[PDB]
């Protein structure tokens, strides 16, 4: 920081008390005590540079090493070849620009220490500046390491030889199949939808006890269309810049794209809307219509879990190993990726009600459904605890476990709301009030918490954007406005939902509430996602990282 | 060879650029004709050195001198199209202070421009090396010096290699177009200096699903009103159009991969042409109204429009789309396709390139459009059998127009082989069509002199099919060849990787030119009026797989032996330089 250092310098300068007012003793110790604090600055700059250019040499000696790797691979395929080549002839040449511009920036920060040391000398008329540079600057490891000269030398060497035949002069002068299968699923999901609409509008009438069917189906619908949005999430997170490969702890190469996932959520569409389809028509009746919903959840646990080598294979095992790491949560210390993912299933808590739904209905108000429900707000409140145990802040994390505890005291108040409804018991005034009165908390500090702490809005250092933060990274303001407008709805929304699905209180209307709002939920997630990772790449409010 | 070479290397060596192999060839030739000391006087010996030395570098001079002719040349139009894209980009800053096309466009030129300045320091590179790398290899094999020497008076002097000129107009493109037209983002002006593969497969899910869904729906929904083959005749002739572009889409990009030059042989732009992906586009497209309009058709919509009006509806939609003077969609690739057909109509008037006579060859090939468009006007008319003359003509149209053509390139070349042996072949067909509707007419009247107009349509029908047969195998192709060392009934050099590829398309053929010659016998005659409509319906999509393989190896031999006498003496013009031209002579540099 040259133009900081030479501010401070000259304020100093400024504020020297002169002899002739006070003491010589009072100005020897200004003078001595801004002499220790802009060595401890300089050092404080110091260190930064020399570990920035140790990474920086680290990395490019492991880059070197992999290239001089791949040139011997390149050697022995001699022994498209010539397109491989002169690939690695640009990848050499980006690389000796990455040394050159290492060279230029330790050049630079000697010059600049050396300069702003002699610019302290001549201030304050003291040579200690000279000693300070002698003793730490000009033996840095920064400054004195010829590691990244004699690297340049065998770079210039290995691309005379080895890519140039000898010819030094051009060393120095040189240095869609996936997306065809997206559209492809996407057509047949189109057309497959359009066409289970048309058969609902007639083949059904108004006829049979559909509704169970409803309950069977809506899981596979808001898991599809979870993915899709994923698969968009994916996509703005790339085009934006936040590093979301480096937040979930992935490998930089070899991950999946906005492709990958928008290809998946296509093909498993296709298998609902045949499965659908089938039920609905009604085929061979050597299998009974019990099978297709149960052949379309087996695939689908079947694809997630095979240990063939096929699909995916790296993303199903990493997956995999997270939901295993997540579910059970106490024992495993919290990454970003395992509350997020919990984050997730929070957001899908109406899947593993159907799968209950499902198997009660398949078997044959209760503690059990309870239970249920509020599973995910379980599995965030004990990882909240967890980390909690291992920081030993109370804050934030006391604080999140109380926001996923509102939700047990609401559900837990509903449902014996319910109980004491269906009963006929005179306590059912006091179940309802109290479930008001933490339907109300919950909704307003799940509120609170998304925007205030999730997305870091609403700060106070907000120049211009009103009610945003200082640093915005998607390009249009109306954006925020609409994600919190909402977010605001959709609380309140998701908090009803989670009344009405777990508790007796809607026995009418109330089932279709669930299937109507449920992908407005997992709507609201998917808008939360965007938020929550700009704010974990530019304020790292998880304080997972250092 | 001589002419895949030519092919190969003619407007590269031959226009702009420096000769590599000829000098190698030189050299090569120079080192193996040296005479002996052992034999000979060292005086001779040193006097034959010192006249191939003088030889070479009189060579070498006249290489440099065009060198610096074509880069003054160049860099004299670069920087006129500088100046002249500078004040245009100053008049459009004016008027804003209609605008923003303005800029968009000027963008667009600008990006041009910046290619071709990448393009030309990219030639300047690649005749420098070439000279440094011809001098260094003649001083290792003569063991002389000079010339190295010769590359400091010259090559490393060369004005060629000095002008700053050329990187100074690029620095001040990059700089002007940030300051002015990227506001400042100088990443994106450099990345501006997916979608339809998404939309082919969206269209081929599409198409695929409403396939099952008329499969299904002609199976179980039948309906008998109004009997179902007018309703074939009508729709045959666009699912044959559709199936021509998918698997014309297939050949081009067979022609890319395999490396045959299908750009230049057309005469296309070099730049800014169609691949695969859009002819995969547009025939998906195109499916998907014609399912669409056959489910309508079957499922019978709303009683207001009568069911006569979705096949009218489809095939003037695909004509007004052909035809639509907005610059909207392929514009450009459509006003070709429309002065080609232009041409082609009107054959006797216009000079034959190559686009035309294959256009005219596909046209023989979907002549069965024309006979539905005939069936379609009659049944319209007289509806709400018959051997009268029209039907005949309208089969024999597009052999008429190869006829007429090759007789215009007869009278253009004044050379009897090939062009008067094309049209005896083109009108073997006229013969075969005549004598087939004159043994229809006097059977159905009942005259005992069918039995001869029978005769002569059997040994017609077999002369023709011979004729087309041979010419296919040995001309059009060019296999069986005496010069094939190894593969065996093919020819010397093939392109495409397996053998057995040839083995296939000639057993094809075979097969195939009798069903193609029985289909139009049938069709246009009345000789099975019982089972002959089903047998049009069955051949017409074999007879177009045949065209399509016939393609691939057409084009081929155009490539390799020139089998058409087409490809010119071009015109001196201008050189725009392409990336095509400066990768040959850096794949050259390597040996």
Known sequence: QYEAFKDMLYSAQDQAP????????????????????????????????????SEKLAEAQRRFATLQNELQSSLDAQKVQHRNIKDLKLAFSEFYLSLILLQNYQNLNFTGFRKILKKHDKILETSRGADWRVAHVEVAPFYTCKKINQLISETEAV??????????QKAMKRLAWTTFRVGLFCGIFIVLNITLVLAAVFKLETDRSIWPLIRIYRGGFLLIEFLFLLGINTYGWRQAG???????ELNPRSNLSHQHLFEIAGFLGILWCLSLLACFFAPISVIPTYVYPLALYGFMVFFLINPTKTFYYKSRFWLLKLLFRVFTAPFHKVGFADFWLADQL??????????????????????????????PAWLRFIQCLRRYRDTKRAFPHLVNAGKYSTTFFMVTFAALYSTHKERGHSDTMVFFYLWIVFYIISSCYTLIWDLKM????????AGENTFLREEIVYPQKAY???????????????????????????????????????????????????????????????????
């Open 18 to 53: 002169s002899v002739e007012v006070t003491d010589e003793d009072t100005v020897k110790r200004y003078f001595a005590k801004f002499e220790e604090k802009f060595f401890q600055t300089c050092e404080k700059e110091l260190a930064k540079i020399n570990t920035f250019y």
């Open 159 to 168: 691309v005379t030889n080895e890519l140039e035949d000898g010819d030094r």
């Open 242 to 248: 936040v590093n979301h490969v480096l937040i979930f």
């Open 346 to 375: 929070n957001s899908l808590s109406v899947i593993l009600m159907d799968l209950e739904y499902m198997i009660c209905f398949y078997s044959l108000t209760y503690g059990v459904r309870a239970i249920v429900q509020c599973i």
């Open 454 to 461: 999730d997305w870091g809005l609403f700060d106070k250092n």
């Open 480 to 546: 925020y406005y609409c994600a919190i407008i909402e977010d605001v709805i959709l609380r309140f929304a998701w908090t009803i939902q989670i009344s009405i699905t777990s508790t007796t209180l809607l026995p009418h209307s109330g089932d279709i509430i669930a299937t109507v709002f449920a992908p407005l939920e997992v709507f609201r997630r998917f808008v939360w996602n965007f938020f929550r990772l700009e704010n974990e790449h530019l304020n790292n409010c998880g304080e997972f990282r250092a």
